[PDB]
Amino acid sequence: NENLMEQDFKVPYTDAINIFKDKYKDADIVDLSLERDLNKFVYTVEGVDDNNEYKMKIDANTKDVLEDKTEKLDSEDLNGVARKEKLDLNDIMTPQQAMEIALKEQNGIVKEWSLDKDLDVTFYKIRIDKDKNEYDIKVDSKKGTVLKVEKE
Amino acid sequence: NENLMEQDFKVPYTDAINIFKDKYKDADIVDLSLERDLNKFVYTVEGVDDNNEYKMKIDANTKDVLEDKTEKLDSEDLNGVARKEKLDLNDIMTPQQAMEIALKEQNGIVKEWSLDKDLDVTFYKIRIDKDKNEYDIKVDSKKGTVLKVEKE
Ligand code: NA
Ligand code: NA
């Protein structure tokens, strides 16, 4: 099934964060998401340091590392500039809590969630499908406020 | 300039191989190539073990690691099956020697070279452009024999 709300993930999102941080001790996380990939659910954790971007994919049930990728940053991102995109992950609500808030704004089926930051606000972005349409709901990761609803 | 024959690479292909092997001590190399990427020349070294494929990109002049990627192998490649593609890199001629042989078979400009294996033969595959056409010349990595000429 594709409903993230009807799944239990043996690996909590905090464990995925910790696996990433343990491997790349100087990196800041800039993106985190959970999505279905065929018959697996997969966390993608992305971060940067002064020199590289790093991307890890982790099975959300088995904790297996499916991808671990380092790439040199572009010129315009080096020397800490990429780090400005870092997420504020302290004292945030759980993905479950964010998905429940989003579902009360827009019913349907939750297909994906991510954490992202713009304008200094770290938000959950919940992807919800209903009938023909796809909706992205942005929820403030601390306050629970619905920040934006967009029909994709 | 794009002519590999008119370049000097400060990092020999053997150093790129050694960087890869030093990082992934149990992996077998299955592909190696040198190509131009914008204003850099870049070695791509790919290998596998029982569980993962590994890909590294190394600047052919500065030795900087531009990419280091690990991915879980597909089901059909696991448990050593991917390893069957491993290159025979012992006692082979240099890329310079292979390119000279290829150029005598087909004049033009050398744009890329790679090492690959099929039918248990490890060969250099030299990419040569002449007028409108692109040619791949395969040269036996030990014997220097021209094995195949194809117009791409
Ligand atoms: Na981000
Ligand atoms: Na190969």
GROMACS .gro file of C-alpha atoms and ligand atoms in nm:
model
  306
    1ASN     CA    1   0.000   0.000   0.000
    2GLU     CA    2   0.103   0.358  -0.075
    3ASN     CA    3  -0.056   0.541   0.219
    4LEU     CA    4   0.226   0.656   0.447
    5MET     CA    5  -0.037   0.712   0.716
    6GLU     CA    6  -0.121   0.341   0.721
    7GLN     CA    7   0.242   0.229   0.747
    8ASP     CA    8   0.464   0.163   1.046
    9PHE     CA    9   0.829   0.244   0.991
   10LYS     CA   10   1.064   0.039   1.204
   11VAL     CA   11   1.331   0.308   1.159
   12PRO     CA   12   1.220   0.644   1.294
   13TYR     CA   13   1.326   0.956   1.102
   14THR     CA   14   1.560   1.049   1.389
   15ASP     CA   15   1.759   0.728   1.337
   16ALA     CA   16   1.805   0.816   0.968
   17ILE     CA   17   1.930   1.161   1.075
   18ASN     CA   18   2.169   0.997   1.325
   19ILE     CA   19   2.309   0.752   1.068
   20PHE     CA   20   2.383   1.045   0.837
   21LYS     CA   21   2.536   1.262   1.111
   22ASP     CA   22   2.747   0.975   1.241
   23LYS     CA   23   2.903   0.923   0.896
   24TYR     CA   24   2.940   1.289   0.801
   25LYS     CA   25   3.020   1.451   1.134
   26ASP     CA   26   3.080   1.801   0.996
   27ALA     CA   27   2.787   1.813   0.753
   28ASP     CA   28   2.462   2.008   0.796
   29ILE     CA   29   2.140   1.841   0.682
   30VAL     CA   30   1.966   2.042   0.411
   31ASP     CA   31   1.689   1.801   0.300
   32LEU     CA   32   1.515   1.496   0.444
   33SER     CA   33   1.233   1.295   0.292
   34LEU     CA   34   1.047   0.967   0.308
   35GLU     CA   35   0.895   0.812  -0.003
   36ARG     CA   36   0.798   0.476  -0.150
   37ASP     CA   37   1.042   0.321  -0.396
   38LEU     CA   38   0.890   0.008  -0.550
   39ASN     CA   39   0.858  -0.231  -0.257
   40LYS     CA   40   1.065  -0.030  -0.008
   41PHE     CA   41   1.012   0.286   0.192
   42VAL     CA   42   1.321   0.498   0.180
   43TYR     CA   43   1.457   0.795   0.373
   44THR     CA   44   1.672   1.028   0.168
   45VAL     CA   45   1.898   1.249   0.380
   46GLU     CA   46   2.102   1.521   0.211
   47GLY     CA   47   2.359   1.750   0.366
   48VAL     CA   48   2.661   1.964   0.291
   49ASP     CA   49   2.987   2.078   0.440
   50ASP     CA   50   3.228   2.344   0.311
   51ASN     CA   51   3.340   2.127   0.018
   52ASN     CA   52   3.092   1.848  -0.063
   53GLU     CA   53   2.728   1.754  -0.080
   54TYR     CA   54   2.633   1.419   0.067
   55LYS     CA   55   2.327   1.207   0.000
   56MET     CA   56   2.223   0.891   0.178
   57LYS     CA   57   1.930   0.662   0.115
   58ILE     CA   58   1.823   0.440   0.403
   59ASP     CA   59   1.556   0.168   0.407
   60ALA     CA   60   1.291   0.290   0.653
   61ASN     CA   61   1.229  -0.063   0.780
   62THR     CA   62   1.561  -0.247   0.758
   63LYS     CA   63   1.804   0.042   0.806
   64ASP     CA   64   2.007  -0.081   0.505
   65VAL     CA   65   2.208   0.195   0.333
   66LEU     CA   66   2.086   0.188  -0.029
   67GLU     CA   67   2.296   0.480  -0.149
   68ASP     CA   68   2.584   0.683  -0.006
   69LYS     CA   69   2.700   0.957  -0.243
   70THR     CA   70   2.956   1.235  -0.203
   71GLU     CA   71   3.002   1.502  -0.474
   72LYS     CA   72   3.221   1.812  -0.482
   73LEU     CA   73   3.006   2.127  -0.444
   74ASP     CA   74   2.979   2.377  -0.730
   75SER     CA   75   3.201   2.687  -0.707
   76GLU     CA   76   2.919   2.914  -0.590
   77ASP     CA   77   2.828   2.680  -0.303
   78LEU     CA   78   3.175   2.628  -0.153
   79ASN     CA   79   3.322   2.764   0.171
   80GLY     CA   80   3.001   2.733   0.372
   81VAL     CA   81   2.756   2.897   0.133
   82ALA     CA   82   2.566   2.566   0.083
   83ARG     CA   83   2.533   2.538   0.461
   84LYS     CA   84   2.287   2.829   0.466
   85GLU     CA   85   2.014   2.586   0.355
   86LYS     CA   86   2.048   2.380   0.672
   87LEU     CA   87   1.729   2.261   0.836
   88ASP     CA   88   1.635   2.353   1.191
   89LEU     CA   89   1.563   2.004   1.327
   90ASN     CA   90   1.560   2.082   1.699
   91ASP     CA   91   1.234   2.046   1.893
   92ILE     CA   92   1.020   1.973   1.589
   93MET     CA   93   0.700   1.772   1.579
   94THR     CA   94   0.696   1.418   1.436
   95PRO     CA   95   0.616   1.339   1.072
   96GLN     CA   96   0.299   1.166   1.200
   97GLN     CA   97   0.187   1.487   1.370
   98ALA     CA   98   0.258   1.692   1.056
   99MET     CA   99   0.070   1.447   0.831
  100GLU     CA  100  -0.236   1.459   1.060
  101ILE     CA  101  -0.239   1.840   1.043
  102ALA     CA  102  -0.207   1.832   0.663
  103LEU     CA  103  -0.485   1.575   0.628
  104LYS     CA  104  -0.725   1.799   0.822
  105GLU     CA  105  -0.649   2.075   0.572
  106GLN     CA  106  -0.685   1.848   0.270
  107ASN     CA  107  -0.813   1.491   0.286
  108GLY     CA  108  -0.670   1.217   0.067
  109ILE     CA  109  -0.374   0.981   0.075
  110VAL     CA  110  -0.026   1.084   0.194
  111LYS     CA  111   0.234   0.969  -0.060
  112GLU     CA  112   0.548   1.148   0.059
  113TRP     CA  113   0.677   1.388   0.319
  114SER     CA  114   0.987   1.603   0.333
  115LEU     CA  115   1.147   1.863   0.555
  116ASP     CA  116   1.271   2.178   0.384
  117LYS     CA  117   1.353   2.538   0.472
  118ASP     CA  118   1.271   2.868   0.305
  119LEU     CA  119   1.265   3.220   0.453
  120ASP     CA  120   1.423   3.077   0.770
  121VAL     CA  121   1.116   2.859   0.831
  122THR     CA  122   1.171   2.483   0.846
  123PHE     CA  123   0.852   2.312   0.740
  124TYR     CA  124   0.717   1.968   0.665
  125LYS     CA  125   0.594   1.945   0.308
  126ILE     CA  126   0.325   1.676   0.290
  127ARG     CA  127   0.226   1.534  -0.049
  128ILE     CA  128  -0.142   1.426  -0.057
  129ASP     CA  129  -0.329   1.274  -0.353
  130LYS     CA  130  -0.708   1.311  -0.381
  131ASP     CA  131  -0.901   1.210  -0.695
  132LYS     CA  132  -0.715   1.343  -0.999
  133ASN     CA  133  -0.513   1.604  -0.808
  134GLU     CA  134  -0.187   1.622  -0.610
  135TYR     CA  135  -0.149   1.867  -0.321
  136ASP     CA  136   0.156   1.988  -0.133
  137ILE     CA  137   0.076   2.108   0.217
  138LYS     CA  138   0.346   2.297   0.407
  139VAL     CA  139   0.327   2.275   0.786
  140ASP     CA  140   0.548   2.476   1.028
  141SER     CA  141   0.765   2.208   1.190
  142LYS     CA  142   0.737   2.360   1.538
  143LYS     CA  143   0.407   2.550   1.549
  144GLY     CA  144   0.192   2.319   1.336
  145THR     CA  145   0.060   2.614   1.135
  146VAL     CA  146  -0.050   2.540   0.780
  147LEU     CA  147   0.181   2.772   0.581
  148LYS     CA  148   0.077   2.697   0.226
  149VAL     CA  149  -0.145   2.470   0.019
  150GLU     CA  150  -0.060   2.421  -0.348
  151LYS     CA  151  -0.224   2.207  -0.617
  152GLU     CA  152   0.047   2.043  -0.829
  153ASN     CA  153   4.171   2.161  -2.613
  154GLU     CA  154   3.983   1.833  -2.649
  155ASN     CA  155   4.256   1.610  -2.794
  156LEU     CA  156   4.356   1.361  -2.523
  157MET     CA  157   4.668   1.289  -2.728
  158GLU     CA  158   4.789   1.647  -2.685
  159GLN     CA  159   4.733   1.651  -2.308
  160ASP     CA  160   4.960   1.561  -2.020
  161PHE     CA  161   4.782   1.414  -1.721
  162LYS     CA  162   4.961   1.474  -1.393
  163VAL     CA  163   4.775   1.178  -1.242
  164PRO     CA  164   4.849   0.854  -1.425
  165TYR     CA  165   4.563   0.605  -1.468
  166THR     CA  166   4.736   0.370  -1.223
  167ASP     CA  167   4.710   0.631  -0.946
  168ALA     CA  168   4.334   0.657  -1.008
  169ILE     CA  169   4.311   0.277  -0.982
  170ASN     CA  170   4.511   0.288  -0.657
  171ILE     CA  171   4.294   0.560  -0.501
  172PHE     CA  172   3.987   0.348  -0.576
  173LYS     CA  173   4.141   0.024  -0.447
  174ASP     CA  174   4.269   0.192  -0.133
  175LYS     CA  175   3.918   0.313  -0.044
  176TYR     CA  176   3.729   0.000  -0.147
  177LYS     CA  177   3.974  -0.276  -0.057
  178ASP     CA  178   3.742  -0.566  -0.143
  179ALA     CA  179   3.600  -0.426  -0.468
  180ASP     CA  180   3.688  -0.538  -0.822
  181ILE     CA  181   3.718  -0.269  -1.089
  182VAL     CA  182   3.469  -0.323  -1.371
  183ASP     CA  183   3.507   0.002  -1.572
  184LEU     CA  184   3.767   0.277  -1.604
  185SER     CA  185   3.759   0.579  -1.832
  186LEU     CA  186   3.910   0.920  -1.894
  187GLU     CA  187   3.705   1.199  -2.049
  188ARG     CA  188   3.680   1.577  -2.061
  189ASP     CA  189   3.420   1.738  -1.836
  190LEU     CA  190   3.399   2.112  -1.908
  191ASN     CA  191   3.739   2.244  -1.799
  192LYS     CA  192   3.858   1.929  -1.621
  193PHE     CA  193   3.981   1.588  -1.730
  194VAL     CA  194   3.826   1.322  -1.516
  195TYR     CA  195   3.892   0.955  -1.447
  196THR     CA  196   3.581   0.755  -1.366
  197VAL     CA  197   3.657   0.429  -1.184
  198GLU     CA  198   3.374   0.184  -1.118
  199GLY     CA  199   3.385  -0.138  -0.923
  200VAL     CA  200   3.174  -0.384  -0.729
  201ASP     CA  201   3.188  -0.616  -0.433
  202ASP     CA  202   2.932  -0.877  -0.323
  203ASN     CA  203   2.682  -0.612  -0.211
  204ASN     CA  204   2.749  -0.271  -0.367
  205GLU     CA  205   2.863  -0.089  -0.676
  206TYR     CA  206   3.109   0.194  -0.625
  207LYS     CA  207   3.190   0.484  -0.853
  208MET     CA  208   3.462   0.741  -0.810
  209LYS     CA  209   3.547   1.043  -1.020
  210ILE     CA  210   3.900   1.179  -0.987
  211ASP     CA  211   4.048   1.492  -1.145
  212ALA     CA  212   4.323   1.367  -1.378
  213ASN     CA  213   4.546   1.664  -1.295
  214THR     CA  214   4.473   1.757  -0.934
  215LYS     CA  215   4.376   1.417  -0.793
  216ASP     CA  216   4.068   1.577  -0.628
  217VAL     CA  217   3.782   1.331  -0.567
  218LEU     CA  218   3.486   1.484  -0.753
  219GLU     CA  219   3.241   1.204  -0.678
  220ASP     CA  220   3.238   0.901  -0.449
  221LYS     CA  221   2.918   0.699  -0.479
  222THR     CA  222   2.811   0.369  -0.324
  223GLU     CA  223   2.481   0.201  -0.423
  224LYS     CA  224   2.333  -0.134  -0.323
  225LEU     CA  225   2.354  -0.381  -0.615
  226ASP     CA  226   2.035  -0.511  -0.780
  227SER     CA  227   1.915  -0.856  -0.670
  228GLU     CA  228   2.049  -1.032  -0.980
  229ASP     CA  229   2.400  -0.888  -0.928
  230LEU     CA  230   2.448  -0.974  -0.560
  231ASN     CA  231   2.671  -1.240  -0.401
  232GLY     CA  232   2.959  -1.196  -0.645
  233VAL     CA  233   2.770  -1.209  -0.975
  234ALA     CA  234   2.861  -0.844  -1.054
  235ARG     CA  235   3.227  -0.931  -0.997
  236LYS     CA  236   3.232  -1.138  -1.317
  237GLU     CA  237   3.270  -0.813  -1.514
  238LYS     CA  238   3.603  -0.735  -1.350
  239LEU     CA  239   3.878  -0.601  -1.573
  240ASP     CA  240   4.210  -0.777  -1.615
  241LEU     CA  241   4.443  -0.484  -1.541
  242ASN     CA  242   4.768  -0.674  -1.492
  243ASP     CA  243   5.052  -0.624  -1.741
  244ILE     CA  244   4.852  -0.406  -1.978
  245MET     CA  245   4.986  -0.140  -2.210
  246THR     CA  246   4.942   0.230  -2.130
  247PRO     CA  247   4.650   0.440  -2.254
  248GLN     CA  248   4.903   0.635  -2.464
  249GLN     CA  249   5.014   0.314  -2.636
  250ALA     CA  250   4.653   0.211  -2.702
  251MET     CA  251   4.560   0.554  -2.842
  252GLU     CA  252   4.859   0.544  -3.082
  253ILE     CA  253   4.750   0.203  -3.211
  254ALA     CA  254   4.392   0.325  -3.257
  255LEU     CA  255   4.505   0.639  -3.438
  256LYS     CA  256   4.699   0.431  -3.693
  257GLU     CA  257   4.377   0.241  -3.762
  258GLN     CA  258   4.166   0.555  -3.786
  259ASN     CA  259   4.306   0.907  -3.785
  260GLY     CA  260   4.129   1.192  -3.610
  261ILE     CA  261   4.108   1.333  -3.259
  262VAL     CA  262   4.090   1.114  -2.946
  263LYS     CA  263   3.808   1.237  -2.722
  264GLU     CA  264   3.781   0.958  -2.465
  265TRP     CA  265   3.924   0.623  -2.369
  266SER     CA  266   3.793   0.345  -2.150
  267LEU     CA  267   3.887  -0.003  -2.040
  268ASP     CA  268   3.615  -0.266  -2.062
  269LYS     CA  269   3.583  -0.644  -2.084
  270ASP     CA  270   3.372  -0.871  -2.301
  271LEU     CA  271   3.423  -1.239  -2.390
  272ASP     CA  272   3.705  -1.249  -2.132
  273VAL     CA  273   3.905  -0.995  -2.332
  274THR     CA  274   3.996  -0.669  -2.156
  275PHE     CA  275   4.033  -0.400  -2.419
  276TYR     CA  276   4.089  -0.029  -2.448
  277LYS     CA  277   3.801   0.138  -2.628
  278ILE     CA  278   3.930   0.456  -2.794
  279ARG     CA  279   3.681   0.720  -2.909
  280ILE     CA  280   3.808   0.911  -3.216
  281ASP     CA  281   3.627   1.192  -3.401
  282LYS     CA  282   3.704   1.261  -3.769
  283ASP     CA  283   3.495   1.503  -3.979
  284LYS     CA  284   3.127   1.433  -3.913
  285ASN     CA  285   3.179   1.083  -3.772
  286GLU     CA  286   3.262   0.922  -3.436
  287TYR     CA  287   3.457   0.596  -3.420
  288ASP     CA  288   3.511   0.349  -3.138
  289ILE     CA  289   3.829   0.146  -3.178
  290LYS     CA  290   3.879  -0.154  -2.950
  291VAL     CA  291   4.240  -0.252  -2.882
  292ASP     CA  292   4.349  -0.568  -2.692
  293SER     CA  293   4.500  -0.429  -2.372
  294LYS     CA  294   4.793  -0.674  -2.375
  295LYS     CA  295   4.852  -0.769  -2.739
  296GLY     CA  296   4.776  -0.436  -2.907
  297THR     CA  297   4.556  -0.608  -3.165
  298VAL     CA  298   4.279  -0.399  -3.316
  299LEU     CA  299   3.971  -0.604  -3.220
  300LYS     CA  300   3.692  -0.395  -3.365
  301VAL     CA  301   3.622  -0.066  -3.540
  302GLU     CA  302   3.269   0.077  -3.522
  303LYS     CA  303   3.122   0.399  -3.659
  304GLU     CA  304   2.888   0.551  -3.400
  305NA      NA  305   1.634   2.207   0.161
  306NA      NA  306   3.295  -0.311  -1.782
   0.00000   0.00000   0.00000
